[PDB]
Motif scaffolding. Structure first.
Motif, PDB file in Angstrom:
ATOM      1  N   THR A 149     -29.279   8.320 -21.172  1.00 13.36           N
ATOM      2  CA  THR A 149     -28.773   7.963 -19.851  1.00 13.36           C
ATOM      3  C   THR A 149     -28.492   9.206 -19.017  1.00 13.36           C
ATOM      4  OG1 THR A 149     -27.786   5.995 -20.846  1.00 13.36           O
ATOM      5  CG2 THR A 149     -27.079   6.582 -18.628  1.00 13.36           C
ATOM      6  N   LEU A 189     -30.348  10.525 -15.595  1.00 17.55           N
ATOM      7  CA  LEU A 189     -29.600  10.861 -14.388  1.00 17.55           C
ATOM      8  C   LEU A 189     -29.905  12.286 -13.935  1.00 17.55           C
ATOM      9  CD1 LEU A 189     -27.821   8.218 -14.988  1.00 17.55           C
ATOM     10  CD2 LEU A 189     -25.954   9.548 -14.017  1.00 17.55           C
ATOM     11  N   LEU A 193     -27.848   3.894 -10.168  1.00 17.97           N
ATOM     12  CA  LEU A 193     -28.058   2.697 -10.971  1.00 17.97           C
ATOM     13  C   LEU A 193     -29.468   2.653 -11.536  1.00 17.97           C
ATOM     14  CD1 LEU A 193     -26.277   0.451  -8.415  1.00 17.97           C
ATOM     15  CD2 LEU A 193     -25.682   0.328 -10.832  1.00 17.97           C
ATOM     16  N   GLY A 239     -29.612   5.086 -14.429  1.00 18.89           N
ATOM     17  CA  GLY A 239     -28.859   4.511 -15.528  1.00 18.89           C
ATOM     18  C   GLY A 239     -29.619   3.395 -16.218  1.00 18.89           C
ATOM     19  N   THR A 240     -30.285   2.544 -15.435  1.00 18.02           N
ATOM     20  CA  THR A 240     -31.079   1.462 -16.005  1.00 18.02           C
ATOM     21  C   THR A 240     -32.229   2.007 -16.838  1.00 18.02           C
ATOM     22  N   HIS A 251     -30.972   3.615 -19.989  1.00 15.98           N
ATOM     23  CA  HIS A 251     -30.630   2.584 -20.957  1.00 15.98           C
ATOM     24  C   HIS A 251     -31.885   1.976 -21.570  1.00 15.98           C
ATOM     25  CE1 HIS A 251     -26.329   2.687 -20.326  1.00 15.98           C
ATOM     26  NE2 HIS A 251     -26.165   1.605 -21.067  1.00 15.98           N
ATOM     27  N   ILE A 252     -32.965   1.852 -20.794  1.00 15.24           N
ATOM     28  CA  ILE A 252     -34.234   1.391 -21.357  1.00 15.24           C
ATOM     29  C   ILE A 252     -34.695   2.343 -22.455  1.00 15.24           C
ATOM     30  CG2 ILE A 252     -36.705   1.149 -20.842  1.00 15.24           C
ATOM     31  CD1 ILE A 252     -35.764  -0.078 -18.089  1.00 15.24           C
ATOM     32  N   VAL A 288     -32.267   2.084 -25.563  1.00 12.89           N
ATOM     33  CA  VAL A 288     -32.529   0.920 -26.402  1.00 12.89           C
ATOM     34  C   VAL A 288     -33.815   1.126 -27.193  1.00 12.89           C
ATOM     35  CG1 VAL A 288     -32.956  -1.561 -26.360  1.00 12.89           C
ATOM     36  CG2 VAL A 288     -31.241  -0.612 -24.876  1.00 12.89           C
TER      37      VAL A 288
END
Ligand code: CHL
Ligand code: CLA
Ligand code: CLA
Ligand code: CLA
Ligand code: CLA
Ligand code: CLA
Ligand code: CLA
Ligand code: CLA
Ligand code: CLA
Ligand SMILES: CC1=C(/C=C/C(C)=C/C=C/C(C)=C/C=C/C=C(C)/C=C/C=C(C)/C=C/C2=C(C)CCCC2(C)C)C(C)(C)CCC1
Lengths: 136, 42, 212, 219, 65
Positions: free
Chosen positions: E15, E19, E44, E47-48, E51-52, E55
């Motif tokens: 993350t 960024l 955002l 961050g998305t 996070h992808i 994961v």
């Protein structure tokens, strides 16, 4: 018979409250009750119509059933008086009750226009309703 | 209601009302007198 | 004295702050501008709907009377086994079908005379003529007459005519709704209207329509 | 002039003309050109004010029966959370003097008389002082703003006779109302994620802040 | 969760690196106080995407190794 003669005390007292309201209306607030000029007419006619229907019902029960009801209450109990004011339902009571009520209703329907040009209006109907009260 | 009675006067609306009434009539007759093949009332 | 003066434009409406429709100026009694759908647009049909409301309300008033007053007499002990929604199924003479056709004959005469009044006002005139006496021409639905205005209350004797017709219409709209309540809550409770009143007045909270 | 996440288009209609104009319209809801229905820059202001007021009543009337109930001041029977009061019969039900649906009919009728009037004041403000509503329409007429009527009934005291104090009070109103709306959102989400009251959540987080928000989707 | 673990480390770093790649890096109204762009939408977004990536890498590490 079971529940209709116990409420035979009202047929004097049903015309009564519109002369009671006129006797405290004209004597206290004459502009007010004379502003309600024709309403006490129809109220006397309606209360006499109630007494008419109830007297017709008592007449139907007299011509069906041969009985007399004497629904007496107590009025003064001090000594030898033991006075009563009860209501004696014979066929003569039925004849006289319809004879009062029908003639009184028709005379009130008449007297709505007989007195319609009279300054003395509501005290006449107070006298009428109190007379019908007294005669019933 | 103005101009709704003109719409209900139109040929399809009026035809569906007439044929719904008529079909209900025939349907209730066939409920009352089902399976009819003769007119025996003379 | 007898003109049937209408209500003013700044009259009380069914929905305050809302615009009354242009086809409800106030000529009819009980005009409060109630027209969310606007079924009285055509005035030639709004006349028929005003007559409809009037007769509907008069029948509903006589009916609510004939339901609640005789139930009061039953509670007083005059009439036996009274229940208005079972008073057609119970026994009389004439089978309730001869009664129906005799009713249709007699009410056909009456309502046909009223219909002839509606289509053409002066056809079925009553209150017979008198020498040098001009019986006033009445309006549809308010014939006046020796038979329907024998106390002469319609021309505006006790009160004006507009407020009396408004009294008729408002009292009768209330009676129409009372009879709808009769027809609904005598089938969703299977009980008496006055019994339902005393039952709700016992506990207004939990004895409502949601109990059943 | 304080701008919280303002944008290029948000500084075209949120200049200063509303209580709380921090320019926060990133999505672009209250744009005046091309409007209609309920997405209007006036109706959205009215909606902010009204949802904020109702949310203030909600926030200081939903934790109040538990602010007191865990301190005495009321019976423990009438000390339920916001959701065990009959408003979530799956989660709880209190028995009042009427069943909950009679009380809903009460709410509907009384609020109908209270808010259809408000609506017709939104449409034509001059109304609600012209029809005989038992004579109390004398105070329901004075509107000015639709959301700030300010009559004998709603504003008996002055509290903002001058425009400076009234502007500061309007700002305080909308800010406390936004805080209360976020609080109601917290109430709903906390009751959904924990199944206990909000005051229980506060007492559990304060005392020993362990598993503050780690209990994700667990009752 | 369980801050300090591998599942936390290789997600936090993904993350923050996304960024960074959006802030000073090759990746990319709403006037923020940030010196050079990187609005809330870009924040955002990074961050998305981080996070992808997080994961993806934590589950590729949980599949094997
Ligand atoms: C005939 C139908 C009729 C209907 C449908 C309405 C409907 C209404 N009137 Mg109303 N009125 C009606 C006749 C009349 N009104 C009024 C005088 C008023 C006033 C003065 C006010 C209303 C208000 C209202 C509203 C509130 C009722 C409510 O809360 O719902 C309740 C529904 C339920 C509980 C059902 C369960 C859900 C609603 C728009 C109020 C308003 O507009 O705000 C208001 O202040 N009416 C008069 C006298 C002129 C009428 C005469 O017939
Ligand atoms: C054109 C060919 C044809 C013919 C001759 C018939 C004939 C018939 N069919 Mg068949 N049928 C046909 C096509 C045909 N059908 C088709 C195409 C289909 C598929 C859609 C069917 C499907 C079908 C079914 C499924 C059924 C029939 C039935 C019937 C019978 C009707 C009984 C009935 O309800 O009438 C009764 C009479 C009327 C409805 C007319 C009433 C008219 C009104 C009331 C006015 C009359 C009074 C008037 C005022 C005058 C009075 C005089 C004076 C006092 C004024 C009859 C034998 C039914 C039956 O009984 O089977 C044998 C049945 O069940 N048919
Ligand atoms: C027989 C029914 C009936 C009819 C024909 C009328 C006719 C009229 N009314 Mg009246 N009215 C009635 C019943 C009726 N009213 C009742 C019961 C109320 C009290 C609820 C009112 C209250 C009322 C007000 C306050 C006003 C009127 C007005 C009017 C006029 C314009 C509206 C119109 O054309 O509607 C025509 C209406 C019909 C053709 C009947 C509707 C039939 C459809 C199929 C719907 C029926 C279903 C209904 C919604 C069920 C109720 C559900 C329940 C839960 C409530 C017209 C003269 C206005 C006026 O100028 O007064 C003279 C006015 O201001 N009415
Ligand atoms: C809308 C008008 C209307 C209609 C259609 C009826 C119809 C009826 N009434 Mg009701 N009634 C009415 C108005 C009406 N009444 C009014 C205004 C009064 C006062 C009464 C008082 C009344 C009594 C006291 C009785 C009836 C009874 C009856 C029934 C037999 C009548 C004959 O004989 C019948 C169902 C009788 C009945 O059989 O009810 C069960 C009965 O006992 N009615
Ligand atoms: C072919 C002969 C005939 C027919 C079919 C009718 C039919 C009718 N007449 Mg008419 N009538 C007739 C001859 C006829 N009349 C004659 C010869 C006279 C004497 C001039 C009248 C005088 C007359 C009056 C005065 C009235 C009727 C009325 C009626 C209606 C009664 C309603 C009903 O069904 O009650 C069951 C009905 C439409 C009544 C009506 O509703 O009129 C619209 C009404 O008031 N009729
Ligand atoms: C309580 C409701 C009510 C009210 C206020 C009125 C009011 C009126 N009616 Mg209506 N009417 C009603 C019910 C009502 N009516 C019903 C239920 C019927 C059906 C029988 C009628 C049938 C009717 C006709 C046929 C006529 C009227 C007429 C009149 C007018 C004069 C009589 C009057 O003042 O009545 C006063 C009413 C009372 C005091 C009610 C108590 C009566 C008890 C129950 C006996 C006036 C506008 C006449 C008119 O407008 O002439 C121009 C006219 O021709 N009405
Ligand atoms: C294809 C479906 C569709 C589309 C594309 C639109 C599009 C639009 N509508 Mg329409 N509308 C629709 C269906 C649709 N509507 C339906 C079905 C209704 C009746 C309920 C309405 C009632 C309606 C009104 C009354 C208004 C609009 C408005 C609008 C405009 C702005 C809406 C907006 O920005 O969101 C704004 C959305 C919100 C602020 C969210 C509010 C909360 C809502 C109620 C949640 C909806 C969630 C949905 C039910 C899914 C959840 C399911 C649940 C079981 C979990 C836009 C032109 C407004 C406008 O500007 O006029 C043109 C106005 N619409
Ligand atoms: C707005 C609003 C609404 C809709 C409610 C609604 C309710 N409150 Mg709340 N309340 C409010 C504001 C509000 N309150 C405010 C502003 C305060 C302060 C309180 C303090 C409060 C307490 C202390 C209690 C309620 C209770 C109740 C319930 C019963 C209400 C009753 O008996 O009448 C009901 C769910 C009672 C409950 O929980 O049941 C209860 O004990 N309320
Ligand atoms: C650099 C670290 C890393 C490692 C070691 C892995 C390793 C793995 N990935 Mg992952 N993956 C990664 C990064 C990584 N991936 C990234 C950056 C993305 C993009 C978000 C993905 C998206 C991804 C998907 C969508 C899938 C895998 C799957 C797999 C497995 C099988 C690949 C195949 O086709 O056979 C394998 C364990 C597949 C699998 O079956 O895993 C269970 C699978 O469906 N990976
Ligand atoms: C420089 C600085 C700063 C900052 C910094 C930082 C460090 C930040 C961080 C931040 C962050 C840290 C952020 C985050 C974000 C996140 C997000 C935004 C997320 C999202 C998520 C999602 C979207 C998900 C999705 C999904 C899921 C659900 C699962 C499945 C799959 C997927 C992945 C798809 C400031 C401004 C203070 C100031 C100055 C200094």
């Amino acid at each position: 018979m079971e529940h209709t003669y116990q409420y035979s005390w009202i047929i004097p007292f049903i015309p009564l409250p519109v002369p009671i309201l006129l006797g405290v209306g004209l004597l206290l607030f004459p502009t007010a009750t004379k502003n309600l000029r024709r309403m006490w007419t129809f109220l006397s006619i309606f209360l006499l119509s109630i007494v008419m229907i109830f007297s017709i019902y008592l007449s139907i029960q007299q011509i069906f059933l041969s009985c007399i009801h004497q629904n007496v209450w107590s009025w003064t109990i001090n000594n030898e008086f033991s006075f009563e004011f009860g209501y004696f339902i014979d066929p003569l009571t039925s004849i006289m009750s319809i004879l009062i009520t029908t003639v009184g209703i028709l005379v009130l329907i008449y007297s709505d226009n007989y007195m319609s040009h009279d300054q003395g209006y509501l005290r006449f109907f107070a006298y009428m309703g109190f007379f019908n009260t007294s005669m019933l | 209601m103005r101009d709704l009675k003109t719409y209900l006067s139109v040929a399809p609306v009026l035809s569906t009302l007439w044929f719904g009434s008529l079909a209900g009539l025939l349907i209730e007759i066939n409920r009352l007198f089902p399976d009819a093949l003769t007119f025996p009332f003379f | 004295s007898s003109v049937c003066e209408p209500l003013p434009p700044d009259r009380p409406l069914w929905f305050p702050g809302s615009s009354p429709p242009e086809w409800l100026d106030g000529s009819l009694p009980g005009d409060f501008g109630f027209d969310p759908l606007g079924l009285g647009s055509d005035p030639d049909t709004l006349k028929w709907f005003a007559q409809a409301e009037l007769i509907h309300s008069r029948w509903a008033m006589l009916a609510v009377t004939g339901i609640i007053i005789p139930e009061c007499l039953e509670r007083l002990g005059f009439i036996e086994n009274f229940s208005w929604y079972d008073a057609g199924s119970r026994e009389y003479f004439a089978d309730s079908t001869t009664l129906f056709v005799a009713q249709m004959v007699l009410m056909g005469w009456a309502e046909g005379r009223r219909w002839a009044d509606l289509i053409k006002p002066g056809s079925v005139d009553i209150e017979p003529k008198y020498p040098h006496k001009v019986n006033p021409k009445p309006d549809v639905g308010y014939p006046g007459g020796l038979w329907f205005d024998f106390m002469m209350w319609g021309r505006g004797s006790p009160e004006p005519v507009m407020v009396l017709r408004t009294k008729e219409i408002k009292n009768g709209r209330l009676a129409m709704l009372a009879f709808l309540g009769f027809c609904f809550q005598a089938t969703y409770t299977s009980q008496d209207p006055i019994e339902n009143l005393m039952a709700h007045l016992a506990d207004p909270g939990h004895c409502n329509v949601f109990s059943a | 002039r304080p701008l919280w996440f303002a944008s290029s288009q948000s500084l075209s209609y949120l200049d200063g003309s509303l209580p709380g104009d921090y320019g926060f319209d990133p999505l672009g809801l209250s744009d005046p050109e091309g409007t209609g229905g309920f997405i209007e820059p006036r109706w959205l202001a009215y909606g902010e004010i009204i949802n904020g007021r109702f949310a203030m009543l909600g926030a200081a009337g939903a934790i109040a029966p538990e602010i007191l109930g865990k301190a005495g001041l009321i019976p423990a029977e009438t000390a339920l959370p916001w959701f065990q009061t009959g408003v979530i019969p799956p989660a709880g039900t209190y028995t009042y003097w009427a069943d909950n649906y009679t009380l809903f009919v009460l709410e509907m009728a009384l609020m109908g008389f209270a808010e259809h009037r408000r609506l017709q004041d939104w449409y034509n403000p001059g109304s609600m002082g012209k029809q005989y509503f038992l004579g109390l329409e004398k105070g329901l007429a004075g509107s000015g703003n639709p959301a700030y009527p300010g009559g004998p009934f709603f504003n008996p005291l002055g509290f903002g006779k001058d425009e400076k104090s009234l502007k500061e009070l309007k700002l305080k109103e909308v800010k406390n109302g936004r805080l209360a709306m976020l609080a109601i959102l917290g109430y709903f989400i906390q009751g959904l994620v924990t199944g206990v009251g909000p005051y229980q959540n506060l007492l559990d987080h304060l005392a020993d802040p362990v598993n503050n928000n780690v209990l994700t989707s667990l009752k | 969760d369980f801050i300090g673990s591998s599942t936390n480390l290789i997600m936090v770093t993904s993350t923050t690196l996304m960024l960074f790649a959006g802030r000073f890096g090759l990746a990319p109204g709403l006037q923020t106080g940030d010196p050079a762009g990187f609005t809330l939408a870009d924040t955002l977004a990074c961050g998305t995407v981080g996070h992808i990536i997080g994961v993806g890498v934590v589950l590729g590490l949980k599949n094997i190794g």
